[PDB]
């Protein structure tokens, strides 16, 4: 198990987005941006892959590395400390993503958990989930898809420390999402995102997804609620990918050339659960998908459950 990095307080992040719809990207800003949050991504790419490795079973070793890693950083407070807004909110972004990582990377090694650990990480990621939901009491953050994904590290949370009120928080951030799916399927937020309105309704469907599969471990059925939305939804991402033509008239711009990929992996859990699993065909075949943002081997975890049987 390698030495954990530094887990610094603070975070100074970069927007690299110029226009209004924030579709076009200043690559300057864009590499300059993935040197300053490099550390946080790399802690995530990083707790991902040990709770991977500890699910293929025979590998504690891989999941106790997890754990220290988590430890680590929960003992030196990392992202709880000065969030630098500067060109845009980048780095309270990352204090969401970077939580949920680690979140998820918690709840799927935690059967291996001292009870030191077990007190300081749960102690870390509570603060970190206030924290977090405290970003969004200013109405002038608009509760677009980082609101959903803020949703993620809550849940986790939620789940990991039985904690019902926090579970509770997290199923208004789900129920948000689902509430805001207009009846053709259209987020309009999203939707605003021009040559990426696709892309975002991909990602704005990633996080209400894993919340959805999470809550199953505390006997709710999520996907029940405003049952169709959530379908009517997805069922626009797959078809966009096989033919972009909806997003294009919808979005007003040509939709970049990209295939699914990443966090596009919620597929994997979701065409298990659709009344039409077919039309994710196309989406499932680009895998397999892993995003340590969403807890790491999403094609993985679909098959073997998020949290792997303890030994
Ligand atoms: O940068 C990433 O790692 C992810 O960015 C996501 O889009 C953000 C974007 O970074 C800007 O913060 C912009 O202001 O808002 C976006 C949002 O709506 O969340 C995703 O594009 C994701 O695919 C990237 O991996």
């Known amino acids: 198990?390698?030495?954990?990095?530094?887990?610094?307080?603070?975070?100074?992040?970069?927007?690299?987005?110029?226009?209004?719809?924030?579709?076009?990207?200043?690559?300057?800003?864009?590499?300059?941006?993935?040197?300053?949050?490099?550390?946080?991504?790399?802690?995530?790419?990083?707790?991902?892959?040990?709770?991977?490795?500890?699910?293929?079973?025979?590998?504690?070793?891989?999941?106790?590395?997890?754990?220290?890693?988590?430890?680590?950083?929960?003992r030196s407070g990392a992202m709880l400390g000065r969030m630098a807004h500067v060109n845009n909110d980048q780095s309270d972004y990352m204090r969401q993503?970077?939580?949920?990582?680690?979140?998820?990377?918690?709840?799927?090694?935690?059967?291996?958990?001292?009870?030191?650990?077990?007190?300081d990480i749960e102690t870390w990621?509570?603060?970190?989930?206030?924290?977090?939901?405290?970003?969004?009491?200013?109405?002038?953050?608009?509760?677009?898809?980082?609101?959903?994904?803020?949703?993620?590290?809550?849940?986790?949370?939620a789940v990991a420390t039985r904690d019902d009120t926090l579970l509770n928080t997290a199923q208004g951030i789900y129920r948000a999402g689902i509430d805001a799916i207009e009846p053709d399927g259209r987020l309009p937020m999203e939707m605003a995102r021009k040559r990426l309105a696709l892309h975002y309704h991909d990602y704005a469907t990633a996080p209400l997804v894993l919340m959805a599969e999470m809550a199953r471990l505390q006997?709710?059925?999520?996907?029940?609620?405003?049952?169709?939305?959530?379908?009517?939804?997805?069922?626009?991402?797959?078809?966009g990918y096989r033919d972009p033509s909806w997003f294009n008239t919808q979005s007003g711009a040509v939709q970049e050339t990209a295939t699914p990929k990443?966090?596009?992996?919620?597929?994997?859990?979701?065409?298990?659960?659709?009344?039409?699993?077919?039309?994710?065909?196309?989406?499932?075949?680009?895998?397999p998908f892993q995003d340590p943002r969403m807890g790491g081997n999403l094609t993985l975890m679909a098959q073997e459950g998020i949290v792997p049987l303890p030994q």
């Open 262 to 287: 990443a966090s596009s992996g919620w597929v994997e859990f979701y065409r298990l659960r659709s009344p039409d699993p077919m039309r994710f065909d196309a989406m499932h075949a680009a895998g």
């Open 1 to 74: 198990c390698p030495a954990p990095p530094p887990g610094s307080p603070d975070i100074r992040a970069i927007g690299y987005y110029t226009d209004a719809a924030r579709s076009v990207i200043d690559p300057r800003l864009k590499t300059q941006n993935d040197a300053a949050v490099k550390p946080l991504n790399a802690f995530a790419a990083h707790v991902a892959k040990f709770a991977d490795a500890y699910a293929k079973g025979a590998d504690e070793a891989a999941g106790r590395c997890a754990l220290t890693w988590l430890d680590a950083w929960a």
């Open 97 to 119: 993503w970077t939580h949920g990582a680690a979140a998820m990377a918690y709840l799927r090694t935690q059967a291996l958990a001292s009870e030191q650990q077990r007190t």
């Open 219 to 239: 006997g709710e059925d999520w996907y029940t609620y405003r049952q169709g939305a959530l379908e009517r939804l997805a069922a626009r991402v797959a078809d």
């Open 125 to 157: 990621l509570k603060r970190l989930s206030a924290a977090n939901l405290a970003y969004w009491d200013n109405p002038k953050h608009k509760r677009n898809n980082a609101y959903y994904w803020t949703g993620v590290g809550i849940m986790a949370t």
